[PDB]
Amino acid sequence: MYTLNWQPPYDWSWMLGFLAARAVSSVETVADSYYARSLAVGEYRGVVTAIPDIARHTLHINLSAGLEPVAAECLAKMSRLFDLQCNPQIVNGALGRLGAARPGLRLPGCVDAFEQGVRAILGQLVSVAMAAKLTARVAQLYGERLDDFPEYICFPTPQRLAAADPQALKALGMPLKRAEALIHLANAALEGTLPMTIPGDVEQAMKTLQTFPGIGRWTANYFALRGWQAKDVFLPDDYLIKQRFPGMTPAQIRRYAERWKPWRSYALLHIWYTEGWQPDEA
DNA sequence: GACATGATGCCT
DNA sequence: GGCAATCATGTCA
Ligand code: NA
């Protein structure tokens, strides 16, 4: 019913492929031509479907009945998930050769910052496939099924996670520190200690998110990128990044990444998806 | 089974 | 730089 525009080029197969690898069973459904998932805007809940239209560079958003009242907030969420604000002619004209290979590359955002936080935490150490299994387990155990769309389940809400038993989450296959971290993150969301949208001083914000238990530099940086759609952050502590920077240490990688300001976030994404990439020997 | 390795948090 | 950490895989006695 709703239509949003985007500025070509846009690589929909990469975006959907990125979201597919991380899809939580019963929450999201990712196809080649569309994306769908349960969605809760406050006491309102339902299913959102995003169907791109490469031809007319338009994204069609469909909403089940229960979300109609809060349509705009739903559109705002899909626009942050799919990064429709992106001006590729600017980012590429800044990353040079680094982006030449994938010009329609976008920053996968999120639909709800608290949810992205959960994911960030359970995305530590393990592979993308195991973090996905973990998040599915947490969802099946703490989420709520939709009334009118039984196949779907809503992602666990902060209140429910704040009440959870640490051991109950642990027994799902995660370290206790990780389980406790989720419980603390949920309590921050409950009271508002968790910035739900990008703040004025991202750096200072991350610095504070780093005081929470179970949340370190990788998690806060990753959260900022995905949950706040922050455009200028790098993940030097990332397992695949250290592998892209053979030998170089995190701090090194840091000064080296600076050359990509203020689009470091996009650079991280291009480097993640450039199989044999390596730094241009200084 | 005792290890050790693959895929972040946090302390000294 | 080391200790803690979970599930999955691969050695080795
Ligand atoms: Na911390």
CA pair distance A240, A232, nearest whole angstrom: 18
A11 as an active site residue: the answer is: no
A78 with A149, same domain?
A: no
A140 with A181, same domain?
A: yes
Nearest to A244 by CA among A257, A229, A231, A232: A257
Does the CB of A229 fall within 7 Å of any strand B atom? no
Nearest to A9 by CA among A110, A96, A99: A99
| Resolution of the solved structure (Å) | 2.5
A117 with A107, same domain?
A: no
CA pair distance A127, A140, nearest whole angstrom: 20
Q: A28-30 and A58-63: which strand pairing?
A: unpaired
Phi first, then psi, for residue A75 (nearest 5°) are -65, -40
Q: How far is the CA of A235 from the C1' of C10 (A)?
A: 30
Phi first, then psi, for residue A177 (nearest 5°) are -60, -40
Range A116-155 burial, b when 16+ CB lie within 10 A, else e = bbbbbbbbbeeeeeebbbbbbbbbbebbeebeeeeebbbb
Q: What angle do CA A41, A117, A252 make, to 5 degrees?
A: 145
Q: What angle do CA A161, A37, A31 make, to 5 degrees?
A: 135
AA letter at A193: T
AA letter at A73: E
CA pair distance A172, A139, nearest whole angstrom: 11
Are A153 and A27 in contact by the 8 Å Cβ rule? The answer is yes
Q: How many Å separate Cα A217 from the centre of its chain?
A: 16
Phi first, then psi, for residue A72 (nearest 5°) are -55, -45
AA letter at A215: I
A66 with A27, same domain?
A: yes
For chain A, how many structural domains are there in total? 3
A165 with A127, same domain?
A: yes
CA pair distance A195, A153, nearest whole angstrom: 25
Q: How far is the CA of A41 from the C1' of B12 (A)?
A: 46
Q: Around Cβ A217, how many Cβ atoms within 10 Å? A: 15
A120 with A195, same domain?
A: yes
Q: Which residue has the tokens 């989720």?
A: A182
Give A96-104's long-range contacts (Cβ < 8 A, gap of 24+). A98/A260, A98/A267, A98/A270, A98/A271, A98/A274, A99/A266, A99/A270, A101/A270, A101/A274, A102/A11, A102/A14, A102/A270, A102/A273, A103/A9, A103/A11, A104/A8, A104/A9, A104/A10, A104/A11, A104/A12, A104/A14
Helices in A231-273 by DSSP H: which ranges? Answer: 239-242, 250-257, 264-272
Residues forming a β-bridge with A36: A29, A49
**Domain that residue A209 falls in:** 113-230
A3 with A106, same domain?
A: yes
Does the CB of A175 fall within 7 Å of any strand C atom? yes
Sorted by sequence, the CB contacts under 8 Å of residue A17 that are 6+ apart come out as: none
**In the β-sheet with A35-41, what is the strand arrangement from edge to edge?**
A2-5, A58-63, A44-53, A35-41, A28-30
3-state secondary structure of A145: strand
Structure tokens at A65: 């009945």
Structure tokens at A80: 């942050």
Q: What angle do CA A177, A180, A182 make, to 5 degrees?
A: 115
Query: DSSP assignment, residue A24?
Result: P
Does the CB of A237 fall within 7 Å of any strand B atom? yes
CA pair distance A175, A244, nearest whole angstrom: 28
Query: From the CA of A92, how far away is ligand 1's center (Å)?
Result: 35
Does the CB of A223 fall within 7 Å of any strand B atom? no
